[PDB]
Amino acid sequence: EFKSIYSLDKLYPESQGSDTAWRVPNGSDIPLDRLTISYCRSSGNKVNSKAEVRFHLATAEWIAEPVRQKIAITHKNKINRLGELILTSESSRYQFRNLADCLQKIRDMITEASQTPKEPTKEDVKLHRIRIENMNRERLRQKRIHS
Amino acid sequence: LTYFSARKGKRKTVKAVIDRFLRLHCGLWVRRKAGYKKKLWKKTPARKKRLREFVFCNKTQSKLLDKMTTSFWKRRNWYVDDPYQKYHDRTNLKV
Amino acid sequence: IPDPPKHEHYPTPSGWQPPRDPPPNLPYFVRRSRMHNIPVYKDITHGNRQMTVIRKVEGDIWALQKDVEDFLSPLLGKTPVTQVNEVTGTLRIKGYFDQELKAWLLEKGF
Amino acid sequence: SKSKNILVRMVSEAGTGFCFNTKRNRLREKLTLLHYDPVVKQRVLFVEKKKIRSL
Amino acid sequence: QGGGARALDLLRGLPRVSLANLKPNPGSKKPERRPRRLGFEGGQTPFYIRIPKYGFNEGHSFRRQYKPLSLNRLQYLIDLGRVDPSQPIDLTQLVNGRGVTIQPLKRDYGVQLVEEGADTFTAKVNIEVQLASELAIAAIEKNGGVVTTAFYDPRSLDIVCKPVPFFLRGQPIPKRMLPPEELVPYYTDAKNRGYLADPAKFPEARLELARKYGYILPDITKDELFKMLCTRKDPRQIFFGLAPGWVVNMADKKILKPTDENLLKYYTS
Amino acid sequence: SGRRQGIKKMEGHYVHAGNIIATQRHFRWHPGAHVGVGKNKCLYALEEGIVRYTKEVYVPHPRNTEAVDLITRLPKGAVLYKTFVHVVPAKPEGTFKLVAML
RNA sequence: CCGAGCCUGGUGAUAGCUGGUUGUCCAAGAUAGAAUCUUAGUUCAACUUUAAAUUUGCCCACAGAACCCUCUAAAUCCCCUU
RNA sequence: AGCAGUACAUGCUAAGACUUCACCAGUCAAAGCGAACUAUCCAAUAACUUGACCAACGGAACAAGUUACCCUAGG
Ligand SMILES: [Mg+2]
Ligand SMILES: [Mg+2]
Ligand SMILES: [Mg+2]
Ligand SMILES: [Mg+2]
């Protein structure tokens, strides 16, 4: 072969190897064999595709037991009747981006769960009235006169 | 407009048009509003905002601009990180 | 132009499929393009006249016109407006049916 | 030469460099305002710096 | 059933075709008509003059352009046998298979691989491009292929796209220039798979893409085609197997290499 | 030397949100239900619906000194009337659609 | 015919405004506005030609369109049906 | 009428519209964010920006008298 002064060997002496750039590094990872990934292709009307990732939260060995409990209460609305946490993304045309969005969602859930000091934030306008409605509902509660 | 140049016998482009207009590959022409940089102190925020918009030309103006430019200015271009890349092609246009 | 390589599973990842062997026995035959694609092309004029053209038609072109009319009439809900060019072996259809016609012709074996 | 109102440029004290022209009476001292400053996304003191034009 | 054979059968009865009975196709000739400054509004400022100047096209001639090659197009080319995945795929093979058309005189700097068709891309290829998107790189790597981004200068791009016209000029193969200062960061970055990037970082960057997009990074070292997959040209090499300074003699099917020390030092520098 | 001002949308016409119903130098038509007012007294639709013109009793704002003086000096039993333009919302705000079966 | 000779060339010089502009047939086909050193001219408008795409167009029931004093009548805008 | 008073979120952004009308220009504006919560080119500038009673006001960058010695033009 031909080697110039700018050959990768000369430019990176310490990186001279046949497998230097193609080794598979064995090594918070999410096992992709445990998850169940489904794709719903576009029909026609949305142009963007849909990718769905679901796994059984309670029996998820990879997630820590304290984390699975915190995730269950925080994301109960996502867990279905079978105890499977269901995540969906349809923000992109390509299945690769949709799947990456779902995996990033799983990572944020595990991270958010481990961060116990949840940040105090101003409530959404929807929550504000519900707080006032919940407060008046307690005001109507009475005590059993004779018990 | 020169239809037949003295040295090449070819149509010429009006460079005044190149200075002021952007042609999308779909045939639309984009321009600035006249006076967008002048006398801002005496213009309301709403007037100033519409003066800094990039607006399309009408059909009559677009056909005139097309005649004043040669085919080179109408070719499809693939500039890297072009801000107007998405606007070159029309979508959901029935006509 | 190279001949397409033989594949174990058809259609290929890109969707290409070779013409059936032996040729389908019909009164007309639709030849492939030099690039081994089905010669169905979208065409437009005046900025608004969307049309579909079927080229390289051999045999009874009128038989293809009736077959195309029966196939497209359910989808449109009316008989499709078409032009038969016997000289050039071309069938011109009003509206865009390139994708539907390509799949329809592929099933026949062209 | 003379006008009832003067056009002058107010510079933000935050040092961002955002400035806006404003109208004040000719017979007045240097104007100071709490005009909103986009760069800092909040109201900030503005100091009159240079005369631009006379109305 | 007979449409072509019927027309030829009709011909047998009709008179001999000759120069005396030809005519143009109806509608191909418009009958001639026999009689038997633009942009000036008449005094006011023309519309194209009263609009303010803005740098829409400023520096257009010096902007770099890249022809987009999609994974759909690349897969389609492989499916029809026009690009062979069993050998390194570069601009020459893409151009030779009529997969892309490159115009160096129109400020084309090569092909930019685009992610369109990533979902259905199945081929395993070793492909050299000038620009590649993150999703496009992931699609190729997920199948066990190798993608690298390399820079060609206007002169080098012209030669690589059309080798035979260059060889007929009779000049020695030049060494391709390095990218400009602005591009140097892009081509020395492993995230882009730059040809001038450190080979040691690549494994980390390759793994990060596999994690983000949710696929298992395959081990190409175990692949039978590993030797081809890792085949790459020196940063100064326009063509595989051909060094700068060599003269190609197509008439005699020979290659001439210079032995002068000064010439060899220049070409290898 | 003339300009065009007046009713852009007549009675029974369909308007979309933001449509300019009328332009006026002075208040000739007053804003009714779902009709906004601009700085220049322009009347525009706040909802999608049908334009309606009605005659409604006029009651000015207590802090509108000029208008309050007028009504206080009116003979008792006399009610001021003005022409109001309204938009009758054609569509509902939204609908409840089944999105999941958990 | 020299208020600045004549000749050749530049030169088929420019402007301005007249005049002229050569066989037949068929189809469509007459508008009356704005800017301009512009009103003897022009370019955007009005009308007009050809081809193409698509869906309403015209006529017009009720209801509806301000006070301020309306000469206040004759009318207008909008508009389903037909 | 070729202005003034008096505020300094005359902040940002964005559906849908109006318009002397042709163009240029001009005008109104929901929701949202953040608050409050009651002419052209030219010339100067780091920038943000500013400047021609260009009043013949769609503005040639910049120029008068006179010809009853008149020259040319058509009506
Ligand atoms: Mg065509
Ligand atoms: Mg006729
Ligand atoms: Mg009607
Ligand atoms: Mg709002």
Side-chain angles (χ1 to χ4, degrees), chain E residues 177-204:
Chain E
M177 297 297 100
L178 292 177
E181 198 186 27
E182 37 179 333
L183 284 187
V184 160
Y186 178 94
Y187 287 107
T188 51
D189 187 7
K191 292 180 178 181
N192 306 317
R193 306 298 182 281
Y195 79 122
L196 291 175
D198 193 336
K201 304 202 169 182
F202 273 59
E204 175 189 357

PDB file of all heavy atoms in Angstrom, chain E residues 177-204:
ATOM      1  N   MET E 177      -5.613  17.419  -1.686  1.00  0.00           N
ATOM      2  CA  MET E 177      -5.312  18.372  -0.634  1.00  0.00           C
ATOM      3  C   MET E 177      -6.105  18.056   0.630  1.00  0.00           C
ATOM      4  O   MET E 177      -7.104  17.334   0.609  1.00  0.00           O
ATOM      5  CB  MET E 177      -5.627  19.793  -1.098  1.00  0.00           C
ATOM      6  CG  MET E 177      -4.787  20.261  -2.276  1.00  0.00           C
ATOM      7  SD  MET E 177      -3.026  20.358  -1.892  1.00  0.00           S
ATOM      8  CE  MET E 177      -2.436  18.825  -2.606  1.00  0.00           C
ATOM      9  N   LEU E 178      -5.637  18.608   1.740  1.00  0.00           N
ATOM     10  CA  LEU E 178      -6.334  18.475   3.003  1.00  0.00           C
ATOM     11  C   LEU E 178      -7.532  19.415   3.027  1.00  0.00           C
ATOM     12  O   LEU E 178      -7.590  20.382   2.264  1.00  0.00           O
ATOM     13  CB  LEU E 178      -5.389  18.794   4.159  1.00  0.00           C
ATOM     14  CG  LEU E 178      -4.254  17.802   4.410  1.00  0.00           C
ATOM     15  CD1 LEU E 178      -3.373  18.305   5.535  1.00  0.00           C
ATOM     16  CD2 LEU E 178      -4.789  16.414   4.726  1.00  0.00           C
ATOM     17  N   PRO E 179      -8.508  19.156   3.890  1.00  0.00           N
ATOM     18  CA  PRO E 179      -9.682  20.025   3.946  1.00  0.00           C
ATOM     19  C   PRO E 179      -9.303  21.410   4.434  1.00  0.00           C
ATOM     20  O   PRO E 179      -8.249  21.588   5.059  1.00  0.00           O
ATOM     21  CB  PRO E 179     -10.608  19.313   4.944  1.00  0.00           C
ATOM     22  CG  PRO E 179      -9.722  18.430   5.735  1.00  0.00           C
ATOM     23  CD  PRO E 179      -8.616  18.022   4.822  1.00  0.00           C
ATOM     24  N   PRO E 180     -10.127  22.419   4.164  1.00  0.00           N
ATOM     25  CA  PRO E 180      -9.839  23.759   4.682  1.00  0.00           C
ATOM     26  C   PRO E 180      -9.938  23.783   6.199  1.00  0.00           C
ATOM     27  O   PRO E 180     -10.410  22.845   6.843  1.00  0.00           O
ATOM     28  CB  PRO E 180     -10.905  24.650   4.034  1.00  0.00           C
ATOM     29  CG  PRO E 180     -11.592  23.802   3.014  1.00  0.00           C
ATOM     30  CD  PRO E 180     -11.381  22.380   3.397  1.00  0.00           C
ATOM     31  N   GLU E 181      -9.477  24.894   6.772  1.00  0.00           N
ATOM     32  CA  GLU E 181      -9.448  25.021   8.225  1.00  0.00           C
ATOM     33  C   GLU E 181     -10.835  24.832   8.827  1.00  0.00           C
ATOM     34  O   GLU E 181     -10.989  24.168   9.859  1.00  0.00           O
ATOM     35  CB  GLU E 181      -8.879  26.386   8.609  1.00  0.00           C
ATOM     36  CG  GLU E 181      -8.411  26.484  10.045  1.00  0.00           C
ATOM     37  CD  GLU E 181      -8.000  27.891  10.426  1.00  0.00           C
ATOM     38  OE1 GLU E 181      -8.520  28.849   9.819  1.00  0.00           O
ATOM     39  OE2 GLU E 181      -7.152  28.041  11.331  1.00  0.00           O
ATOM     40  N   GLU E 182     -11.859  25.405   8.193  1.00  0.00           N
ATOM     41  CA  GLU E 182     -13.215  25.298   8.724  1.00  0.00           C
ATOM     42  C   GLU E 182     -13.685  23.848   8.780  1.00  0.00           C
ATOM     43  O   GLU E 182     -14.379  23.451   9.723  1.00  0.00           O
ATOM     44  CB  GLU E 182     -14.189  26.133   7.886  1.00  0.00           C
ATOM     45  CG  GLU E 182     -13.918  26.151   6.385  1.00  0.00           C
ATOM     46  CD  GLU E 182     -14.937  26.971   5.621  1.00  0.00           C
ATOM     47  OE1 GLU E 182     -16.083  27.094   6.100  1.00  0.00           O
ATOM     48  OE2 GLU E 182     -14.590  27.490   4.539  1.00  0.00           O
ATOM     49  N   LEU E 183     -13.345  23.051   7.766  1.00  0.00           N
ATOM     50  CA  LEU E 183     -13.811  21.668   7.722  1.00  0.00           C
ATOM     51  C   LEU E 183     -12.978  20.753   8.611  1.00  0.00           C
ATOM     52  O   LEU E 183     -13.486  19.741   9.108  1.00  0.00           O
ATOM     53  CB  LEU E 183     -13.809  21.163   6.278  1.00  0.00           C
ATOM     54  CG  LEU E 183     -14.953  21.652   5.384  1.00  0.00           C
ATOM     55  CD1 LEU E 183     -14.932  20.940   4.043  1.00  0.00           C
ATOM     56  CD2 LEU E 183     -16.306  21.461   6.056  1.00  0.00           C
ATOM     57  N   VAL E 184     -11.700  21.070   8.804  1.00  0.00           N
ATOM     58  CA  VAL E 184     -10.773  20.228   9.563  1.00  0.00           C
ATOM     59  C   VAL E 184     -11.428  19.683  10.830  1.00  0.00           C
ATOM     60  O   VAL E 184     -11.271  18.492  11.131  1.00  0.00           O
ATOM     61  CB  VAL E 184      -9.483  20.994   9.901  1.00  0.00           C
ATOM     62  CG1 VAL E 184      -8.754  20.334  11.065  1.00  0.00           C
ATOM     63  CG2 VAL E 184      -8.573  21.042   8.688  1.00  0.00           C
ATOM     64  N   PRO E 185     -12.151  20.495  11.607  1.00  0.00           N
ATOM     65  CA  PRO E 185     -12.821  19.935  12.792  1.00  0.00           C
ATOM     66  C   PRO E 185     -13.790  18.814  12.465  1.00  0.00           C
ATOM     67  O   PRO E 185     -13.852  17.820  13.200  1.00  0.00           O
ATOM     68  CB  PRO E 185     -13.541  21.151  13.387  1.00  0.00           C
ATOM     69  CG  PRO E 185     -12.728  22.305  12.964  1.00  0.00           C
ATOM     70  CD  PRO E 185     -12.205  21.966  11.598  1.00  0.00           C
ATOM     71  N   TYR E 186     -14.555  18.945  11.380  1.00  0.00           N
ATOM     72  CA  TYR E 186     -15.532  17.918  11.036  1.00  0.00           C
ATOM     73  C   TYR E 186     -14.857  16.597  10.692  1.00  0.00           C
ATOM     74  O   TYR E 186     -15.300  15.532  11.138  1.00  0.00           O
ATOM     75  CB  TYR E 186     -16.396  18.394   9.865  1.00  0.00           C
ATOM     76  CG  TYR E 186     -17.412  17.376   9.396  1.00  0.00           C
ATOM     77  CD1 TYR E 186     -18.713  17.397   9.876  1.00  0.00           C
ATOM     78  CD2 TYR E 186     -17.071  16.395   8.475  1.00  0.00           C
ATOM     79  CE1 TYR E 186     -19.642  16.472   9.456  1.00  0.00           C
ATOM     80  CE2 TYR E 186     -17.995  15.466   8.049  1.00  0.00           C
ATOM     81  CZ  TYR E 186     -19.281  15.509   8.542  1.00  0.00           C
ATOM     82  OH  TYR E 186     -20.209  14.587   8.123  1.00  0.00           O
ATOM     83  N   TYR E 187     -13.787  16.640   9.901  1.00  0.00           N
ATOM     84  CA  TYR E 187     -13.144  15.423   9.421  1.00  0.00           C
ATOM     85  C   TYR E 187     -12.172  14.815  10.421  1.00  0.00           C
ATOM     86  O   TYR E 187     -11.728  13.682  10.210  1.00  0.00           O
ATOM     87  CB  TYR E 187     -12.431  15.704   8.099  1.00  0.00           C
ATOM     88  CG  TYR E 187     -13.392  15.887   6.946  1.00  0.00           C
ATOM     89  CD1 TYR E 187     -13.628  17.140   6.403  1.00  0.00           C
ATOM     90  CD2 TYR E 187     -14.079  14.805   6.414  1.00  0.00           C
ATOM     91  CE1 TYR E 187     -14.511  17.309   5.358  1.00  0.00           C
ATOM     92  CE2 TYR E 187     -14.963  14.964   5.370  1.00  0.00           C
ATOM     93  CZ  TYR E 187     -15.176  16.218   4.844  1.00  0.00           C
ATOM     94  OH  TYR E 187     -16.056  16.381   3.803  1.00  0.00           O
ATOM     95  N   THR E 188     -11.819  15.528  11.488  1.00  0.00           N
ATOM     96  CA  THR E 188     -10.986  14.979  12.550  1.00  0.00           C
ATOM     97  C   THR E 188     -11.808  14.521  13.748  1.00  0.00           C
ATOM     98  O   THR E 188     -11.236  14.231  14.804  1.00  0.00           O
ATOM     99  CB  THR E 188      -9.947  16.009  12.997  1.00  0.00           C
ATOM    100  OG1 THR E 188     -10.593  17.255  13.278  1.00  0.00           O
ATOM    101  CG2 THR E 188      -8.897  16.212  11.917  1.00  0.00           C
ATOM    102  N   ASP E 189     -13.128  14.445  13.608  1.00  0.00           N
ATOM    103  CA  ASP E 189     -14.028  14.070  14.689  1.00  0.00           C
ATOM    104  C   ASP E 189     -14.540  12.655  14.459  1.00  0.00           C
ATOM    105  O   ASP E 189     -15.027  12.335  13.371  1.00  0.00           O
ATOM    106  CB  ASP E 189     -15.200  15.049  14.781  1.00  0.00           C
ATOM    107  CG  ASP E 189     -16.067  14.808  15.998  1.00  0.00           C
ATOM    108  OD1 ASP E 189     -15.689  13.975  16.847  1.00  0.00           O
ATOM    109  OD2 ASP E 189     -17.129  15.455  16.107  1.00  0.00           O
ATOM    110  N   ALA E 190     -14.426  11.811  15.487  1.00  0.00           N
ATOM    111  CA  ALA E 190     -14.880  10.431  15.365  1.00  0.00           C
ATOM    112  C   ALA E 190     -16.396  10.341  15.258  1.00  0.00           C
ATOM    113  O   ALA E 190     -16.916   9.389  14.666  1.00  0.00           O
ATOM    114  CB  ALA E 190     -14.385   9.607  16.554  1.00  0.00           C
ATOM    115  N   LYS E 191     -17.121  11.309  15.824  1.00  0.00           N
ATOM    116  CA  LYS E 191     -18.577  11.287  15.731  1.00  0.00           C
ATOM    117  C   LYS E 191     -19.041  11.289  14.281  1.00  0.00           C
ATOM    118  O   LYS E 191     -20.077  10.696  13.960  1.00  0.00           O
ATOM    119  CB  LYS E 191     -19.170  12.481  16.476  1.00  0.00           C
ATOM    120  CG  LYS E 191     -18.986  12.420  17.981  1.00  0.00           C
ATOM    121  CD  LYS E 191     -19.605  13.627  18.665  1.00  0.00           C
ATOM    122  CE  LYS E 191     -19.461  13.545  20.174  1.00  0.00           C
ATOM    123  NZ  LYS E 191     -20.085  14.711  20.857  1.00  0.00           N
ATOM    124  N   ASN E 192     -18.298  11.950  13.398  1.00  0.00           N
ATOM    125  CA  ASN E 192     -18.601  11.970  11.975  1.00  0.00           C
ATOM    126  C   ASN E 192     -17.926  10.836  11.217  1.00  0.00           C
ATOM    127  O   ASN E 192     -18.134  10.713  10.006  1.00  0.00           O
ATOM    128  CB  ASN E 192     -18.173  13.307  11.366  1.00  0.00           C
ATOM    129  CG  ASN E 192     -18.768  14.492  12.089  1.00  0.00           C
ATOM    130  OD1 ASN E 192     -19.949  14.496  12.431  1.00  0.00           O
ATOM    131  ND2 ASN E 192     -17.950  15.509  12.329  1.00  0.00           N
ATOM    132  N   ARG E 193     -17.128  10.012  11.896  1.00  0.00           N
ATOM    133  CA  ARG E 193     -16.346   8.962  11.246  1.00  0.00           C
ATOM    134  C   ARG E 193     -15.338   9.573  10.278  1.00  0.00           C
ATOM    135  O   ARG E 193     -15.057   9.025   9.211  1.00  0.00           O
ATOM    136  CB  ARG E 193     -17.250   7.958  10.528  1.00  0.00           C
ATOM    137  CG  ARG E 193     -18.327   7.340  11.407  1.00  0.00           C
ATOM    138  CD  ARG E 193     -17.738   6.533  12.552  1.00  0.00           C
ATOM    139  NE  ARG E 193     -18.779   5.898  13.356  1.00  0.00           N
ATOM    140  CZ  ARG E 193     -19.497   6.522  14.286  1.00  0.00           C
ATOM    141  NH1 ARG E 193     -19.294   7.807  14.541  1.00  0.00           N
ATOM    142  NH2 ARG E 193     -20.425   5.859  14.958  1.00  0.00           N
ATOM    143  N   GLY E 194     -14.788  10.722  10.661  1.00  0.00           N
ATOM    144  CA  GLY E 194     -13.887  11.432   9.771  1.00  0.00           C
ATOM    145  C   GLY E 194     -12.678  10.587   9.409  1.00  0.00           C
ATOM    146  O   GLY E 194     -12.151   9.832  10.228  1.00  0.00           O
ATOM    147  N   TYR E 195     -12.238  10.724   8.156  1.00  0.00           N
ATOM    148  CA  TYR E 195     -11.084   9.966   7.687  1.00  0.00           C
ATOM    149  C   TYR E 195      -9.794  10.422   8.359  1.00  0.00           C
ATOM    150  O   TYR E 195      -8.818   9.667   8.392  1.00  0.00           O
ATOM    151  CB  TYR E 195     -10.987  10.065   6.163  1.00  0.00           C
ATOM    152  CG  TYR E 195     -10.399  11.350   5.622  1.00  0.00           C
ATOM    153  CD1 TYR E 195      -9.278  11.331   4.807  1.00  0.00           C
ATOM    154  CD2 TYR E 195     -10.989  12.576   5.891  1.00  0.00           C
ATOM    155  CE1 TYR E 195      -8.748  12.494   4.294  1.00  0.00           C
ATOM    156  CE2 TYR E 195     -10.467  13.746   5.380  1.00  0.00           C
ATOM    157  CZ  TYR E 195      -9.347  13.699   4.582  1.00  0.00           C
ATOM    158  OH  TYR E 195      -8.820  14.860   4.072  1.00  0.00           O
ATOM    159  N   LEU E 196      -9.765  11.645   8.887  1.00  0.00           N
ATOM    160  CA  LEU E 196      -8.612  12.158   9.614  1.00  0.00           C
ATOM    161  C   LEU E 196      -8.785  12.068  11.127  1.00  0.00           C
ATOM    162  O   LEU E 196      -7.986  12.650  11.865  1.00  0.00           O
ATOM    163  CB  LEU E 196      -8.337  13.608   9.214  1.00  0.00           C
ATOM    164  CG  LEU E 196      -7.828  13.837   7.791  1.00  0.00           C
ATOM    165  CD1 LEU E 196      -7.716  15.323   7.506  1.00  0.00           C
ATOM    166  CD2 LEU E 196      -6.492  13.147   7.569  1.00  0.00           C
ATOM    167  N   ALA E 197      -9.802  11.358  11.602  1.00  0.00           N
ATOM    168  CA  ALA E 197     -10.066  11.235  13.026  1.00  0.00           C
ATOM    169  C   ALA E 197      -9.257  10.093  13.632  1.00  0.00           C
ATOM    170  O   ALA E 197      -8.823   9.168  12.943  1.00  0.00           O
ATOM    171  CB  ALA E 197     -11.555  11.011  13.279  1.00  0.00           C
ATOM    172  N   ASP E 198      -9.062  10.172  14.944  1.00  0.00           N
ATOM    173  CA  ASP E 198      -8.289   9.160  15.649  1.00  0.00           C
ATOM    174  C   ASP E 198      -9.001   7.811  15.572  1.00  0.00           C
ATOM    175  O   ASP E 198     -10.184   7.721  15.930  1.00  0.00           O
ATOM    176  CB  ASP E 198      -8.092   9.569  17.106  1.00  0.00           C
ATOM    177  CG  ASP E 198      -7.042   8.736  17.812  1.00  0.00           C
ATOM    178  OD1 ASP E 198      -6.791   7.592  17.379  1.00  0.00           O
ATOM    179  OD2 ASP E 198      -6.468   9.224  18.806  1.00  0.00           O
ATOM    180  N   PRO E 199      -8.330   6.745  15.125  1.00  0.00           N
ATOM    181  CA  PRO E 199      -8.991   5.431  15.094  1.00  0.00           C
ATOM    182  C   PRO E 199      -9.347   4.893  16.468  1.00  0.00           C
ATOM    183  O   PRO E 199     -10.247   4.051  16.567  1.00  0.00           O
ATOM    184  CB  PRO E 199      -7.957   4.535  14.399  1.00  0.00           C
ATOM    185  CG  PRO E 199      -7.086   5.469  13.645  1.00  0.00           C
ATOM    186  CD  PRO E 199      -7.001   6.692  14.494  1.00  0.00           C
ATOM    187  N   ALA E 200      -8.677   5.349  17.528  1.00  0.00           N
ATOM    188  CA  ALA E 200      -8.925   4.798  18.857  1.00  0.00           C
ATOM    189  C   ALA E 200     -10.282   5.234  19.399  1.00  0.00           C
ATOM    190  O   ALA E 200     -10.921   4.492  20.153  1.00  0.00           O
ATOM    191  CB  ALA E 200      -7.810   5.217  19.813  1.00  0.00           C
ATOM    192  N   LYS E 201     -10.722   6.446  19.057  1.00  0.00           N
ATOM    193  CA  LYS E 201     -11.996   6.945  19.568  1.00  0.00           C
ATOM    194  C   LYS E 201     -13.182   6.231  18.929  1.00  0.00           C
ATOM    195  O   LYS E 201     -14.227   6.068  19.569  1.00  0.00           O
ATOM    196  CB  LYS E 201     -12.084   8.453  19.345  1.00  0.00           C
ATOM    197  CG  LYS E 201     -10.921   9.218  19.951  1.00  0.00           C
ATOM    198  CD  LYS E 201     -11.262  10.677  20.192  1.00  0.00           C
ATOM    199  CE  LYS E 201     -10.195  11.363  21.029  1.00  0.00           C
ATOM    200  NZ  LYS E 201     -10.538  12.781  21.324  1.00  0.00           N
ATOM    201  N   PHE E 202     -13.050   5.817  17.666  1.00  0.00           N
ATOM    202  CA  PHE E 202     -14.149   5.184  16.930  1.00  0.00           C
ATOM    203  C   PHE E 202     -14.956   4.179  17.745  1.00  0.00           C
ATOM    204  O   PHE E 202     -16.187   4.310  17.784  1.00  0.00           O
ATOM    205  CB  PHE E 202     -13.589   4.513  15.667  1.00  0.00           C
ATOM    206  CG  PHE E 202     -13.494   5.433  14.487  1.00  0.00           C
ATOM    207  CD1 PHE E 202     -12.735   6.588  14.549  1.00  0.00           C
ATOM    208  CD2 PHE E 202     -14.168   5.144  13.314  1.00  0.00           C
ATOM    209  CE1 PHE E 202     -12.648   7.434  13.464  1.00  0.00           C
ATOM    210  CE2 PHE E 202     -14.084   5.987  12.226  1.00  0.00           C
ATOM    211  CZ  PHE E 202     -13.324   7.134  12.302  1.00  0.00           C
ATOM    212  N   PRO E 203     -14.361   3.167  18.386  1.00  0.00           N
ATOM    213  CA  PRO E 203     -15.178   2.223  19.170  1.00  0.00           C
ATOM    214  C   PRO E 203     -16.138   2.901  20.133  1.00  0.00           C
ATOM    215  O   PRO E 203     -17.298   2.487  20.244  1.00  0.00           O
ATOM    216  CB  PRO E 203     -14.116   1.390  19.897  1.00  0.00           C
ATOM    217  CG  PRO E 203     -12.960   1.394  18.977  1.00  0.00           C
ATOM    218  CD  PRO E 203     -12.947   2.757  18.341  1.00  0.00           C
ATOM    219  N   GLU E 204     -15.683   3.934  20.842  1.00  0.00           N
ATOM    220  CA  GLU E 204     -16.565   4.643  21.762  1.00  0.00           C
ATOM    221  C   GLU E 204     -17.718   5.300  21.011  1.00  0.00           C
ATOM    222  O   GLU E 204     -18.884   5.168  21.400  1.00  0.00           O
ATOM    223  CB  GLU E 204     -15.765   5.681  22.552  1.00  0.00           C
ATOM    224  CG  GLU E 204     -16.601   6.564  23.469  1.00  0.00           C
ATOM    225  CD  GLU E 204     -15.803   7.713  24.053  1.00  0.00           C
ATOM    226  OE1 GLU E 204     -14.585   7.792  23.784  1.00  0.00           O
ATOM    227  OE2 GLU E 204     -16.392   8.537  24.783  1.00  0.00           O
TER     228      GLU E 204
END
